[PDB]
Amino acid sequence: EEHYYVSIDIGSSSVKTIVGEKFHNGINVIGTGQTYTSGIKNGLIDDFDIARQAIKDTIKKASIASGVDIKEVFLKLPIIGTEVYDESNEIDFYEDTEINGSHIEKVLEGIREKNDVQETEVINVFPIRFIVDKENEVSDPKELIARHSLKVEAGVIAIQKSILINMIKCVEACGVDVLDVYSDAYNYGSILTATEKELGACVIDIGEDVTQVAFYERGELVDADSIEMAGRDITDDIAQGLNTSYETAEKVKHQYGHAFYDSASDQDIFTVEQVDSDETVQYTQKDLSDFIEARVEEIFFEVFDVLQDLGLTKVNGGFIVTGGSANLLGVKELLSDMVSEKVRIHTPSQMGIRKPEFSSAISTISSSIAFDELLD
Numbered sequence: 001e002e003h004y005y006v007s008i009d010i011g012s013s014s015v016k017t018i019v020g021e022k023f024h025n026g027i028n029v030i031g032t033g034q035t036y037t038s039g040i041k042n043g044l045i046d047d048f049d050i051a052r053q054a055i056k057d058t059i060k061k062a063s064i065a066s067g068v069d070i071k072e073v074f075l076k077l078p079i080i081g082t083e084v085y086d087e088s089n090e091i092d093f094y095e096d097t098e099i100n101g102s103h104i105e106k107v108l109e110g111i112r113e114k115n116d117v118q119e120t121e122v123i124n125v126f127p128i129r130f131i132v133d134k135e136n137e138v139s140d141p142k143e144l145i146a147r148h149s150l151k152v153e154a155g156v157i158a159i160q161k162s163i164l165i166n167m168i169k170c171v172e173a174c175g176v177d178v179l180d181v182y183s184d185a186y187n188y189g190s191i192l193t194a195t196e197k198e199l200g201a202c203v204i205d206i207g208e209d210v211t212q213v214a215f216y217e218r219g220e221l222v223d224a225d226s227i228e229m230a231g232r233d234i235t236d237d238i239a240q241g242l243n244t245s246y247e248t249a250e251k252v253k254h255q256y257g258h259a260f261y262d263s264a265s266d267q268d269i270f271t272v273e274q275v276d277s278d279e280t281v282q283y284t285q286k287d288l289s290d291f292i293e294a295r296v297e298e299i300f301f302e303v304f305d306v307l308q309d310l311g312l313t314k315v316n317g318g319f320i321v322t323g324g325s326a327n328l329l330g331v332k333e334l335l336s337d338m339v340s341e342k343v344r345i346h347t348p349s350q351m352g353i354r355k356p357e358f359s360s361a362i363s364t365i366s367s368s369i370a371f372d373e374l375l376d
């Protein structure tokens with residue numbers, strides 16, 4: 001009777017898998033898997049076989065770590081080729097009907113059916129509110145008696161069919177079933193406080209190839225997008241600036257990386273190899289932070305451009321930065337120097353996943369739980 005929730009994040013840098021348990025009104029992580037791969041680029045499958053093997057290896061790792069024979073999983077989908085919009089649907093009753101999870105599922109399904117865009121598929125439909133018998137608004141209609149109808153006013157996330165199909169295919173080629181998919185646009189709602197989600201908060205996830213942006217207000221997702229600029233570009237800038245290899249630039253980024261120049265130490269020194277020579281050059285943390293700060297600043301300017309385009313300039317709920325690149329020192333200080341609102345770095349609380357790169361994978365689990373609770 002043991003119930004586990006397994007999520008998979010097919011990242012450009014690494015595939016991440018989490019095995020979760022419902023505990024103390026939250027999630028207990030009993031196992032994780034992580035595999036760095038080259039099969040994924042810009043959040044999409046670049047080499048099917050390599051990606052497939054990476055996913056398989058990650059599922060194996062999580063299975064060994066948790067002691068669970070993983071057969072069914074929940075898959076996150078990146079905010080790429082994605083559209084967010086509002087839609088309503090209503091189902092009719094011709095006799096007094098006690099509402100249950102099946103009616104909710106039906107009325108939500110109708111919204112999936114309403115989409116007639118051939119290239120895209122609706123992946124998530126989440127209720128904003130319910131209306132019983134055209135007049136009575138409710139948060140949760142279950143166990144209420146409807147005499148005429150049940151309407152839902154919902155948020156909808158649709159994605160390019162090619163992405164959905166390919167990701168699911170790649171995962172299911174590893175001997176597991178994909179139970180459901182969850183867009184990160186929906187997922188990131190879980191890392192926010194009720195206050196943040198109410199006032200108007202912006203989530204910025206800086207990964208390797210992709211930076212994702214999602215805005216929430218009045219307790220619901222408003223809109224989302226992604227930018228093709230993240231950690232890899234920071235590394236590129238380091239490699240170019242220090243005239244070193246990409247590999248060395250990556251290691252240097254982890255070891256001495258700092259995103260705020262004024263706070264970076266010129267007394268903290270390190271040595272680096274050269275590409276066009278056999279000689280070695282010494283650099284300081286401040287020298288490095290010059291390039292790192294320039295790139296991260298550019299990323300945040302891209303984020304501001306997205307917010308301006310979406311008409312979401314007012315961010316009273318503040319900024320919440322996550323993802324692997326949020327591991328960099330000085331990120332919070334830089335963004336705080338760029339905005340008048342509150343800024344924080346989100347890191348999952350559970351032991352084993354206290355790294356910001358896991359934010360998506362854990363959130364996915366929450367998402368699934370939420371729907372489980374909704375369709376009761």
Ligand SMILES: Nc1ncnc2c1ncn2[C@@H]1O[C@H](COP(=O)(O)OP(=O)(O)OP(=O)(O)O)[C@@H](O)[C@H]1O
Pocket residue numbers: 010011012013014015042043206207208209210211230231232250253254257323324325326327328329356357358
């Ligand atoms: N301690 C650290 N300091 C600086 N950067 C780091 C650190 N740890 C990881 N990173 C960077 O984070 C990035 C990977 O983050 P993450 O795992 O969130 O990306 P992903 O989800 O695999 O890729 P994407 O979301 O872009 O498809 C890499 O660019 C890596 O260099």
Ligand SMILES: [Mg+2]
Pocket residue numbers: 011012207208323360
């Ligand atoms: Mg990611």
